Design a protein around this ligand. Structure first.
Ligand SMILES: OC[C@H]1O[C@H](O[C@H]2[C@H](O)[C@@H](O)[C@@H](O[C@H]3[C@H](O)[C@@H](O)[C@@H](O)O[C@@H]3CO)O[C@@H]2CO)[C@H](O)[C@@H](O)[C@@H]1O
Length: 370
């Protein structure tokens, strides 16, 4: 009798999802319960853990697109019905992000590109070049989730590295670019931010950086709209700006992430499920999510709205979009996330950038047991 939605988005966006769900239930009669999985210890892949034993939700809301390759390969996702998605209403990369083996398996709700969040009280105007960045980082501090590939990939790609080679829109899982000479240069810079610039210590991570930023102790840190609520609560007069150009004069290449919503193949109420997904991902819903969290809408028409076009978050997004690399969504991407722990070793100076890079790729190539 009840439709269960698992949401990986929390805070104000979760409140909006609950509101929309309640309105939907009011018209349809079907009861709806929205569960917050954002802090679940098993992470995003918890959907697979649950669905593999037939204990998953009816609908999933707020799932980063890279995770869906696993879910789709295992047959845990209902293909999107014909006509539900109008590809012309999104940027090309946005729709490609929700396709697995050429089939659309989820609906785009938001698009994300990590950026530098800065404290205007400490840094009035944001740095754009590495030189300017060093000056501001030295003067007021800089920290981020340095050992997390999702964020530090911006540096890797900036030096020519890549995860899986993209050719003709298709990714080659065997052609990895995380150990190229360019990637090694990037890892060297990551280590340098600790050993040379002293902006961070080997223990610095995302949690610590966020805490320091909310306390007004550092002027810059790398984040996204998921922190909007907490930043405003801390009363930080924050700004958003693109990653600065790197020491090699090139632009950093942060990942492009697409937040998606989808239906469990095992759900007994597929038609109702897609109707609920439509309500949770409509232009109106996206307008709400933006107003309350600054999450950039996946729909181009909402991106072109006055509220979005005038925002600092969108300005940074549009400035980085051309350099953003969509996260791979093939199953092998999980092997990459699972082997990135070696980045910490490089940043701590326990292993050289060259050796660490080599082992990183070798570990990825071991793959994941089916
Ligand atoms: O680190 C490995 C991890 O990288 C990618 O995850 C990023 C998310 O795509 C991105 O949205 C953001 O996650 C935030 C949630 O969306 C938000 O609701 C709330 O829970 O805070 C999160 C920040 O901790 O950042 C993560 C990276 O930390 C990739 O999509 C994952 O599959 C992968 O495991």
């Amino acid at each position: 009798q009840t439709i269960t939605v698992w949401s990986w988005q929390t805070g104000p966006e979760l409140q909006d999802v609950k509101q929309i769900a309640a309105q939907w239930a009011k018209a349809h009669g079907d009861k709806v319960i929205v569960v917050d999985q954002s802090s679940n210890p098993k992470g995003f892949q918890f959907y697979a853990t649950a669905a593999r034993t037939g204990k998953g939700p009816d609908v999933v809301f707020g799932m980063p697109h890279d995770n869906n390759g696993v879910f789709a390969e295992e047959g845990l996702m209902a293909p999107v019905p014909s006509g539900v998605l109008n590809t012309g209403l999104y940027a090309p990369n946005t729709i490609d992000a929700i396709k697995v083996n050429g089939t659309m398996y989820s609906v785009p709700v938001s698009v994300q590109v990590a950026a530098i969040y800065y404290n205007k009280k400490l840094v009035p105007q944001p740095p754009q070049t590495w030189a300017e960045f060093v000056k501001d980082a030295n003067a007021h501090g800089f920290m981020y989730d340095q050992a997390n590939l999702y964020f530090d990939y911006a540096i890797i790609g900036g030096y020519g590295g890549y995860v899986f080679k993209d050719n003709n829109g298709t990714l080659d899982p065997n052609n990895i670019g995380l150990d190229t000479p360019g990637a090694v240069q990037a890892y060297t810079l990551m280590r340098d931010m600790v050993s040379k610039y002293h902006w961070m210590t080997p223990s610095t991570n995302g949690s610590i950086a966020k805490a320091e930023f909310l306390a007004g102790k550092i002027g810059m840190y790398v984040s996204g709209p998921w922190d909007t609520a907490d930043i405003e609560k801390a009363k930080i007069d924050f700004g958003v700006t693109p990653w600065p150009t790197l020491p090699n004069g090139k632009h950093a290449t942060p990942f492009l992430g697409v937040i998606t919503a989808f239906v469990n193949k095992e759900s007994k109420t597929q038609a109702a499920d897609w109707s609920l997904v439509q309500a949770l991902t409509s232009a109106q819903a996206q307008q709400m999510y933006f107003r309350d969290s600054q999450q950039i809408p996946a729909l181009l028409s909402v991106q072109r709205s006055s509220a979005v076009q005038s925002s600092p978050t969108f300005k940074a997004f549009v400035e980085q979009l051309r350099y953003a690399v969509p996260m791979p969504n093939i199953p092998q991407m999980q092997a990459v996330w699972q082997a990135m722990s070696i980045l910490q070793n490089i940043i701590a100076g326990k292993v050289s950038p060259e050796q660490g890079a080599k082992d990183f790729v070798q570990n990825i190539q071991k793959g994941i047991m089916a």
